[PDB]
Structures are given as C-alpha cells and as structure tokens.
C-alpha cells in the first residue's frame, strides 16, 4: 500500500512504528492480536476439531551469519617477542563463551588457518574442551562467560599447561601437560582465535596486580608474566580483514605461474596453471590475478605499423589467451586500480563498486559527470557470445588503453568489442584477470603488441618508453588476491571524546591531541603502509635500510647540494619522529640517526674535530680572566664548563627552500632545530 517504518507515526508520510519484525514488535499490539487469536484457536478446539502440531525440531543455525570470508580472527603478539627459553605465563579472559582458542603460536603461523589445525600452533579450545596441535584431541573442560584461562609455557622442559580459573586442566589421562613434547624452533608467542560474535581479552601481565589467577597457579612455579620485564606495551598483530594482492608463492598448493620467454615469432607470456586440478580439495573458487606494475594515465587530457606513430603515441596493449578447456564464461579480462579489494565467491560484472560524480553550474545545469570505479573488465563468455568451436585457437582478448585520452577498449578476435570504459586522469590501471579454474590450463598474459599500439612494457617502464619490442622484465610478475596477511594494531589511538551536550545541541565529538604515524609508500603498487609494520617484513626493511645507507653515502663528506636535495625526501619532522619513536626497528632507527647526522651535523662536526688539536688563543680580557681552578679549593671543575676563548670554526647553516632560485644556499649544511 506504500507504508514504511518510522520511530513516530505519521499519516501524511505513511510512517508507522509497527512495521518491525515480530521479534522486535511491542507487546501491546502483540497481545491485542494474540487474545483474539487464542479465543479463535480455543473455539476451534471446543467445536470438536483437535489440532496437533506438525513436529518439534531441535536444529542449530550455527550462528555463522557473519561475512562468508571471515569465520574467525587471530590476535597474536609480535614475532620479535618469541621466547626460546624460560617459563612464561599469560591470561585470556573470555567475555563471552563460544568458539575461542588460546595458546602459543610459531612465528610462521598463518592468519587464515584454524589454531592447531597444523603444526604451527598449540591451542586450547574451551568451546568443545579440546587441545589443538596438528590434529584434535580431548583436553580439559568447557569454560563459561567471564572465565580466565591461564596459559603457561616451559621452554626449558618443553611443556605447556592450561588453567581454568586457577585450576589446572587435565587431558584424557591425569597428565597436567597439555603438550608433552615439541621442538623449540623459532620460539612461541601468545595467540588466540575468536569466532563469530566472540569477545576476548589477552593479558600479558605487564601489570602483575592485574592478573587474576597468577598467584593461585603460576606465581610460585617459576613462571614469568609475558611482559613483566618490559617498559613498553607489547605490539599487537591480528588477521587482516581486507585481502591484498601479493606475488604468487612458488610453493602454492593450487596456482602455478610460468614465465614464457618471447621468441622472434612469439611474445612474452605469463601462464597461470591450476596445478591441483583433478584431485582432492582442488580450489574451485574464483581467483583474482593482476600484474605487479600499473599503467598510469596522462595528468591532463587533451580536448605495417608506423614508426613515427608508435613513437608519438600513448596507446598500450596486452592480450590474455584463455586456453581450450577453460570455460570463457568463468574468466574476466580487463583492468583494476589499487582500490580493488573485493574477494567474493560469486563475482559478476554488474556488482563492481562504482560511483558517479556530477558537477553542475549554479542553477542545476549539469556540465560534467564522471564515472569512477576500480574494476574495468569484460567477460570472456559474453565476448564469445555465439557458441564457437572452442578448438580453432585459445580465446585471445586484447585490452587496449589510451593513456593520452583515458580510453579502455577491448578486442575479442580481431573485432572491437562494444564495451568500452573512460577513466579519470592520473588513474593507475593494473592488468587483471578474474578466473575460475575449469581446466589445468586456465590462461596466460601475452605481452605482445598489435598494429599502431605501443607494447605494455613501454608504459610500465620509463627506460623502455620508446622500445617497440615487447619485453617482460623480472619486476613484472603475477600477483593474486589472498588473505594470508597480518595487520599491526597501532600502539596509540586518537583520543576522541563523544558526549551528548543536550537535546538541542546534538552530539559533541571532540579531538585535540595530535597523533602522527610515518608512512612508507610503495610506488609500483600504489599502496602505503606504516613504517612500523616493517618489523615483520624483512625484504622491505633491508631495502629501506640500504636506501638510508645510500642517502648517507650520496651526501657523505660535505656534499651540501646533495644534502639540500635529500632534505626534500627526508624532512626534519620525519627525522624527529624516527629518532623519538620507541617501536621503530633497530636498522631503520640507526639508519635515520646516521641520516640526520650526515645531513645536518656532519660537516660542522668534522670541521671542529679538525680544528680540535690546534689552539689559537687571542688575547682579550676574557682570556686574562681564565684561571686553572674555579676557586681557591683546587678541585677540578666539570670538563667543558667554563670560559673558553680559543678560536673555533664558525657555525653557519642555510635554509633548505625549493621555491628560491638564489643558488647561494648550496654552501653550508641545511638548518635543523638545534635546541
């Protein structure tokens, strides 16, 4: 009829409060209908017709109503806190009761796997009263809401123990050892896994008084709280909800990527093969692949083959060959941006994220409309459309991007497809393919070129910007969307005060205390992370440390111009944050200290150390006033304190400014706040 729900009833807008689920419905109308209902059913019974229920069922919905990609979240300590010896203790308070596990995990434990399902973790699951390590057994009992589980590890004797509210849990036998024997390996860290609608708390005993049952069971057995000898909060890592693109591992259970060299008669190819096809537990879900480097469109849009046209053009091409045996309807080919993070089992081209920004003149009169999305792709099945023989050749879909105009076009087989896209300037597009494996051979990225179109490697690499010969350098590779990643919980959050001032004034949200983090940007992937996350990313940490070493080297030994240039890349707020931050990795900390010293202090420090062993003392009354001892009591004063009149090099610095054109600032080192 047209009515909708509203907190207050309104005839004119057809809003009523009764349009709510019967579970949330108020009792008054509920009982008003139920009285007549009861009278009717009792009258039915009285008139001689007896009514019996169909059946009574006892079924559980499994409370799995969360997102299909997330059944649990894993919270662990940082990898650097791994313990390889001694006795350690921590606590896990269960706010709710449900599918929760707690224990010790190896540094290599994966965030997308159940705790104890493999060899990488030892866990206790009080939902079913079980112990989990590379299998399932029966151990202990089931907790309730508010129960505290004390986890103990003894790395000297290679034992693990669990207590519920201070009482030691037992296995099927009378043994108190949850896990009798295990290799030390790289150590263990506290870990927990929480299922759907589960709330936990992990206490590392930084404040011993906050522990509940440590004294009852663990204080006197020689077990140390996991954070007793720490002056700083333990960094938290946790499973990443948002999937990210990363290079396909060489040991992947399902996907194999083969790099095919480009001959004179062929083109470079990156072939994706499903190595697990035709066997148990083969991954039949759709998988999202992309190339590691993007094509960047022009900043400003203008309003056989020809060599001059190729040199002057900004049109790049690649092709994807869906092999025979793989259904084209399960393969999508096109481009994505760095904003694509949508991992869904059922993917359709009509469900991609999109928006339209419409800009008009003062009185309506729309003068521009821009469609913005992160997925510009086409379907191979609809590209085929009439049912073909599927044996003539692999279905070769060619993607063409015009960066000078932001135009994305597709070719099915020598014919231009109707579907096309228009992208906003400065967009970075990653060649992407979304495929569901229906054969061991799925597809391959062919990096060739067609008539009057520049090869993709040219737009990928600035060095080969004018090289018509297609190339596949080692930097270009195939990445796939995956959930095997960790997130670093920040040690400090913004202090936001929210309150209700009054009915008229609304809700007040206030934030005053500044908070900053140091961001590391990956240029090729167009993604930024926190530099504190490098504690667990070794290759990026090593490369950035060597980059800082190169920064020191280029300006070493009084290269003031290079130091001024480096002041643009590493500014003094960054330097101060790096030197003051306590969670920064040691390598980066040392590198940034060295960078600060070499950019702002090294020149004058060296000059003074060079005039150190020479004493040119002018004669003034200040010199005459100098005495060996400060007073009659011939006791040495504090060294350095006193009146020194010896000549010393002058200290001068130049302000680093890149809007000036003076060119005289390249003498002296750049300034820094010395106080």
């Amino acid at each position: 009829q047209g009515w909708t729900y509203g907190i207050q009833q309104d005839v004119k807008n057809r809003r009523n409060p009764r349009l709510v689920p019967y579970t949330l419905l108020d009792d008054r109308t509920k009982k008003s209908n139920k009285d007549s209902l009861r009278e009717a059913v009792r009258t039915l019974l009285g008139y001689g017709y007896n009514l019996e229920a169909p059946d009574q069922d006892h079924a559980a919905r499994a409370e799995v109503c969360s997102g299909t990609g997330e059944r649990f979240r894993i919270f662990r300590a940082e990898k650097t806190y791994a313990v390889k010896a001694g006795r350690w203790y921590f606590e896990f308070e269960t706010v709710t009761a449900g599918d929760m596990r707690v224990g010790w995990s190896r540094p290599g434990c994966q965030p997308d796997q159940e705790l104890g399902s493999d060899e990488r973790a030892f866990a206790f699951d009080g939902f079913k009263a079980q112990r989990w390590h590379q299998g399932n057994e029966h151990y202990g009992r089931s907790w309730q809401a508010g129960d505290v589980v004390g986890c103990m590890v003894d790395m000297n004797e290679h034992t693990m123990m669990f207590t519920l509210n201070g009482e030691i849990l037992l296995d099927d036998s009378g043994s108190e050892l949850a896990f009798k024997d295990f290799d030390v390996g790289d150590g263990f860290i506290p870990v927990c896994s929480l299922g759907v609608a589960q709330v936990g708390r992990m206490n590392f005993g930084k404040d011993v008084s906050t522990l509940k049952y440590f004294t009852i069971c663990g204080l006197q057995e020689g077990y140390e709280p996991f954070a007793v000898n720490t002056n700083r909060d333990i960094t938290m890592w946790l499973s990443k909800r948002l999937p990210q693109f990363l290079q396909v591992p060489s040991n992947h259970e399902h996907i194999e990527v083969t790099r095919i060299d480009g001959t004179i008669d062929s083109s470079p190819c990156l072939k994706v093969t499903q190595k697990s096809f035709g066997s148990q537990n083969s991954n039949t879900d759709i998988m999202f692949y992309r190339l590691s480097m993007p094509i960047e469109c022009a900043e400003v849009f203008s309003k056989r083959d020809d060599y001059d046209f190729l040199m002057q053009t900004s049109t790049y091409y690649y092709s994807v060959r869906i092999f025979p045996g793989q259904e084209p309807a399960n393969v999508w080919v096109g481009w994505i941006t760095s904003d694509f993070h949508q991992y869904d089992t059922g993917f359709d081209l009509d469900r991609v994220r999109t928006v339209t920004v419409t800009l008009g003149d003062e009185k309506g009169k729309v003068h521009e409309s821009i469609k913005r999305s992160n997925c510009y792709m086409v379907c191979a099945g609809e590209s085929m459309s009439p049912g073909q023989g599927r044996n003539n050749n692999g279905l070769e879909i060619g993607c063409v991007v015009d960066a000078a105009s932001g135009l994305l076009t597709f070719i099915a087989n020598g014919k231009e497809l109707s579907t096309y896209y228009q992208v906003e300037p400065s967009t970075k597009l990653f060649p992407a393919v979304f495929a569901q494996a229906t054969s061991p051979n799925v597809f391959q990225f062919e990096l060739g070129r067609i008539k009057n179109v520049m090869p993709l490697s040219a737009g990928l690499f600035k060095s080969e910007h004018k090289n018509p010969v297609p190339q596949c350098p080692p930097r270009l590779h195939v990445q796939f969307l995956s959930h095997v990643l960790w997130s670093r919980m920040p040690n400090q959050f913004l202090k936001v005060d929210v309150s209700r001032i009054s009915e008229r004034q609304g809700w007040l949200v206030q934030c005053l205390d500044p908070l900053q983090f140091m961001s590391l940007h990956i240029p090729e992937e167009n993604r930024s992370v926190d530099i504190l996350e490098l504690t667990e990313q070794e290759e990026l940490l090593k490369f950035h440390y060597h980059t800082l070493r190169l920064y020191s080297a280029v300006c070493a030994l009084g290269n003031h111009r290079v130091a001024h240039a480096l002041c643009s890349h590493v500014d003094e707020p960054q330097l101060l944050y790096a030197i003051e931050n306590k969670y920064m990795p040691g390598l980066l900390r040392a590198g940034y200290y060295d960078l600060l010293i070499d950019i702002h202090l090294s020149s004058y420090a060296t000059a003074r150390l060079m005039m150190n062993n020479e004493y040119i003392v002018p004669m003034t009354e200040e010199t005459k006033s100098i005495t060996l001892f400060p007073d009659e009591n011939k006791k040495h004063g504090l060294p350095g304190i006193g009146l020194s009149t010896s000549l010393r090099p002058r200290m001068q610095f130049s302000s680093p400014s890149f809007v000036s054109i003076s060119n005289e600032c390249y003498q002296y080192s750049p300034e820094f706040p010395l106080d």
């Binding site: 907190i7 409370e63 708390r201 994220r353 007040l508 949200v509 950035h544 500014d571």
Partner: protein, 290 residues
C-alpha cells in the same frame, strides 16, 4: 658520482620507497543503518547535519583532515566496508564512502573541486546539511544553507548506509540528527526524513567509533571476532503462501461457526469495555459501528 646518482635516482620517486608523516584519522558514525530493498519497510530519503564548533587548520605541519558524509557497508555487515581501520584514511578514501570537505567531493580516494557560494574549507561555525536519497541513488550537500553544486549518484545500494565524519586531531564538531538529538539549523528538503527516525524501537541512538578498536588499556581492550550480518536492518515480510492450499468443506461449515463466535467475541468485548454508536468518525471518541 654522488651528483649523478642523486640526480638520476632521487627525483623520480618511483623506485625507492617514500616516507612521509601522516596525521592519524578517526571516524565517528551514529548507530544507524539505512538500506533500500524490494519489499522492505525502510524509508528511502534521509537528512542530517554536522555543525563545526571549532577547528584548527594546522595542528601539525600537515593540514587538518575533516570530511563529512555517508558511508556504506559490505553486504549487510555492520563493518564499514573497503577501508582501513587504523588511520590515515577517512570518508571518501574508498568506493564505499562519499564525503565532502567544504571544497571537494571525495570518493574512491579521489577529490573533485565543487562550486559553492563563497567557497572555503570547513571552518568554525559551519553548518553542513547532508541528504541521501536511495530511490534514485543521490547524495547532496548544503553548506550554511547554500546548495553545493556537486552530487554523488549511481552508487552501489546493496549495503547499508550511515552518516559518518572523518577527522584528524584539532576539531570540535556536533552531529544534529533532528528531534531530540540536535535541532536542525535549516529546514530539511521536502521528502527527507531526519536521521533520528531510523532508530529501532528497542535500541537507543548513539554516536560511536566506526571501527572496533579505540584508545584503551592493553588488558582492558576487547578483542572481537567476526560479527553476524544485520538481518534485522532490512525488514522484508514474507509470509507462508495460502493460495496453493485448499479449504475443505468441513473446515468451511465449521469456519461459519468460528466466524460467528469471534464476531460475538468482539461485539461483547466492546460492550464490556465501552464502545457504542457514533454519528461522526473520530479517533478520540473510541467508538465503532460494528
């Protein structure tokens, strides 16, 4: 060699990793979920306001972040979809959020400058009116009662929408959701309902963090697992069909007696509790011609 390496490596900013200090950004939203679906009882047009009591343009060397607008979820989940949860990003930095910062419309981490009478960045004593129409997907803004000549449209409506504000340190803002949760400084556009009307009868309106984790003690912090989808957000009444079933004759001529008995029930009930004849139709007089 030093000059060559510097001039041939540093200015590109395309190979070496780049470092920069970024202000932490936090988001606040009301506990309101707005969605549109076939057969649902939810209203389609909503309106709210944000008024800025104070802001500091530069608390740090980086410009203060302050954006206001609407954010969507990823398929009935209570989580704000498609965005990071720690800091650095705000409204309009993903394709699930649509924001306004006083000069620019932000979506997909891309900003478009938008015209307005006396354009300026969000400052002290600024009133922002946000309007969301789901029948035809549209998000519109009005600064200080003046229309903003920019608009979001044709976005995904398969999730749940909510008001949202993203900010760095150095602000004092106030949500005005209408009714008893902040009187509107300007009259809402016709057909737009205040955001306070979306509260379910049992729950209470609140303004809380868009993400699960905030500043607390280590041992007092609540770690949350996955959360169930909000099926109650969309109320689509689908009953058991009765067209396929057939009434037997015996149930019919006993239905006659049941109907007469229940009719007697209502009539005698209105005798004992006081209905009677009424010449004119009025709700207060509480009388029925039955």
């Amino acid at each position: 060699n030093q000059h060559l390496i510097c001039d041939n490596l540093l200015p590109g900013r395309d190979l070496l990793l780049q470092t920069r200090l970024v202000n932490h950004v936090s988001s606040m939203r009301p506990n309101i979920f707005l969605g549109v679906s076939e057969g649902s009882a939810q209203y389609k047009k909503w309106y709210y306001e944000l008024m800025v009591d104070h802001t500091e343009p530069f608390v740090t060397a980086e410009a203060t972040h302050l954006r206001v607008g609407w954010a969507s979820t990823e398929g009935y989940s209570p989580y704000p979809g498609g965005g990071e949860e720690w800091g650095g990003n705000g409204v309009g930095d993903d394709l699930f959020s649509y924001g306004f910062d006083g000069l620019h419309l932000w979506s997909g981490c891309i900003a478009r400058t938008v015209s307005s009478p006396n354009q300026h960045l969000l400052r002290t004593d600024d009133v922002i009116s946000c309007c969301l129409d789901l029948s035809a997907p549209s998000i519109s803004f009005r600064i200080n009662g003046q229309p903003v000549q920019g608009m979001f449209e044709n976005f995904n409506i398969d999730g749940l929408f909510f008001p949202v504000v993203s900010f760095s340190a150095g602000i004092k803002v106030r949500f005005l959701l209408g009714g008893r949760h902040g009187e509107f400084k300007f009259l809402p556009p016709p057909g737009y309902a205040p955001c306070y009307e979306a509260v379910l009868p049992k729950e209470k309106l609140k303004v809380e963090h868009s993400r699960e984790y905030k500043q607390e003690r280590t041992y007092t912090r609540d770690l949350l697992g996955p959360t169930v989808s909000l099926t109650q957000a969309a109320f689509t009444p689908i009953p058991v069909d009765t067209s396929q079933i057939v009434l037997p004759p015996h149930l019919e001529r006993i239905r006659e007696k049941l109907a007469e008995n229940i009719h007697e029930l209502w009539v005698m009930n209105k005798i004992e509790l006081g209905w009677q004849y009424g010449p004119v139709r009025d709700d207060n007089k509480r009388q029925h011609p039955c």
